[PDB]
Amino acid sequence: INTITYDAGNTTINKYATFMESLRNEAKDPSLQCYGIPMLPNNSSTIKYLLVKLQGASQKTITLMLRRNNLYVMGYSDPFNGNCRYHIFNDITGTERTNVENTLCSSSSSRDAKPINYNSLYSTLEKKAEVNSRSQVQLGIQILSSDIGKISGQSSFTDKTEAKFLLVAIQMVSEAARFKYIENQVKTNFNRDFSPNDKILDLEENWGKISTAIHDATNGALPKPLELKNADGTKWIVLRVDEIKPDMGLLNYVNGTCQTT
Numbered sequence: 472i473n474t475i476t477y478d479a480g481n482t483t484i485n486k487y488a489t490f491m492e493s494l495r496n497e498a499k500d501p502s503l504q505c506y507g508i509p510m511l512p513n514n515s516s517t518i519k520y521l522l523v524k525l526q527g528a529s530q531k532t533i534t535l536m537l538r539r540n541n542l543y544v545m546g547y548s549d550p551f552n553g554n555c556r557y558h559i560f561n562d563i564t565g566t567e568r569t570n571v572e573n574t575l576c577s578s579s580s581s582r583d584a585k586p587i588n589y590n591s592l593y594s595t596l597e598k599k600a601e602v603n604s605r606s607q608v609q610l611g612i613q614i615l616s617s618d619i620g621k622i623s624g625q626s627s628f629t630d631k632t633e634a635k636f637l638l639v640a641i642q643m644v645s646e647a648a649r650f651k652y653i654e655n656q657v658k659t660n661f662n663r664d665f666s667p668n669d670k671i672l673d674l675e676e677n678w679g680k681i682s683t684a685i686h687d688a689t690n691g692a693l694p695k696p697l698e699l700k701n702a703d704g705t706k707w708i709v710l711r712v713d714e715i716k717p718d719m720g721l722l723n724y725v726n727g728t729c730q731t732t
């Protein structure tokens with residue numbers, strides 16, 4: 472397993488761009504692409520996971536563990552009282568839950584559990600964060616850095632604080648890797664807090680559908696119109712791969728053959 476590192480507390484646009492490229496390159500199957508967009512591996516690859524080590528306020532760190540097959544965050548660890556403190560979502564099942572603990576903490580000599588007492592669905596995180604929608608949760612570099620400090624090394628924090636941290640980190644790491652559009656929103660707003668627009672949220676919700684549509688396209692034509700949203704919330708109807716391609720960073724794994732270029 473490899474670790475991609477990113478210091479959100481002392482950074483620049485160009486450093487975040489490099490981080491995104493590194494994350495995409497570690498996540499993707501080296502051999503799979505459709506229409507020149509790299510695709511994630513199936514769930515039976517030899518290297519199943521990846522670590523993303525984030526640094527933030529007061530140089531405190533959190534490590535995210537991501538599944539390569541779909542880039543979902545499985546849990547995170549923080550240095551706490553000399554221990555690898557591992558936090559896993561409450562629906563991560565049996566032996567994979569064992570694997571997440573062992574993967575997060577392998578080089579560490581001591582560990583302690585602090586479970587995430589909920590699952591990773593956006594609806595769940597929004598409920599825990601006490602917001603109507605993650606549209607209401609500002610994103611940004613400084614926010615990410617500060618949120619890291621509210622969790623890492625802290626003996627106590629509320630589920631709300633955690634869920635807001637997770638909304639920010641999941642979108643700025645996994646969703647940004649999946650979507651160049653979302654990466655570009657971060658970079659455009661690099662020096663400020665921003666409210667994610669309707670296109671960010673819509674892309675996040677439709678990644679699977681988009682990945683299927685692109686994979687199953689013949690000579691660039693999507694089998695059915697894809698109903699998405701523009702940045703200002705208006706309806707965006709996509710008919711061909713080239714219309715959506717510039718927004719894509721990674722495709723979800725989809726079995727079968729596709730036009731690779």
Ligand SMILES: *[C@@H]1O[C@H](CO)[C@@H](O)[C@H](O)[C@H]1NC(C)=O
Pocket residue numbers: 480481482
């Ligand atoms: C960021 O890091 C650079 C290089 O180590 C350092 O010179 C600078 O003071 C840091 N920025 C701040 C204000 O933390």
